[PDB]
Amino acid sequence: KVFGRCELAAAMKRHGLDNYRGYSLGNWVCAAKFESNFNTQATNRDTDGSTSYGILQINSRWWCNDGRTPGSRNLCNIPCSALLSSDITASVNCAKKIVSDGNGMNAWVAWRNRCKGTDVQAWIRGCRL
Numbered sequence: 211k212v213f214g215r216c217e218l219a220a221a222m223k224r225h226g227l228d229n230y231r232g233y234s235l236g237n238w239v240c241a242a243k244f245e246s247n248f249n250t251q252a253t254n255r256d257t258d259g260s261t262s263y264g265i266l267q268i269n270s271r272w273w274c275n276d277g278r279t280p281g282s283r284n285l286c287n288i289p290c291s292a293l294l295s296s297d298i299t300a301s302v303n304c305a306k307k308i309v310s311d312g313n314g315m316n317a318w319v320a321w322r323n324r325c326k327g328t329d330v331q332a333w334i335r336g337c338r339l
C-alpha cells in the first residue's frame with residue numbers, strides 16, 4: 211500500500227505515535243516519507259547483509275526475523291514480512307520498541323539526516339487529525 215501523507219498521519223496518530231517518547235506526529239510522518247516514500251512494501255538491503263522492511267524500514271539485524279541475517283535478533287518477535295502489510299500495526303508496535311532503545315529517533319538514519327531539527331509540523335499540514 212502507498213499511503214497518502216494525511217492517511218498515514220491519521221493511522222500513526224490512532225496507533226499512539228503522536229508524542230510517543232516525546233516525538234511529535236510530524237517526526238514520524240517525515241521519517242516514513244524518507245524511509246519508504248509511504249510505501250508499506252518497501253524493502254532495502256543494507257551493506258551489513260541485513261534488510262530493512264516497510265513503512266518505517268525496520269531492520270533485521272535487531273528487530274525482526276527474515277532468516278537471512280546471520281547473528282541477528284528478533285526483538286519485536288515478528289517475521290520481517292509482517293512489516294510489509296497494508297495494516298501498519300506491527301510496524302508501529304515495533305517502532306515503539308526501537309524509539310525506546312536509548313537513542314530516540316536517531317535509530318532511523320534518514321530521520322537524523324533529513325528530519326531532525328527541521329519544520330516537521332509541515333508533514334501534517336492540511337490534515338484533519
Ligand SMILES: [Cl-]
Nearest residue numbers: 214215243248
Ligand atoms: Cl508527500
Ligand SMILES: [Cl-]
Nearest residue numbers: 234235236331
Ligand atoms: Cl508535528
Ligand SMILES: [Cl-]
Nearest residue numbers: 277278279280
Ligand atoms: Cl536470521
Ligand SMILES: [Cl-]
Nearest residue numbers: 275288289290
Ligand atoms: Cl519469523
Ligand SMILES: [Cl-]
Nearest residue numbers: 231313314315
Ligand atoms: Cl529522545
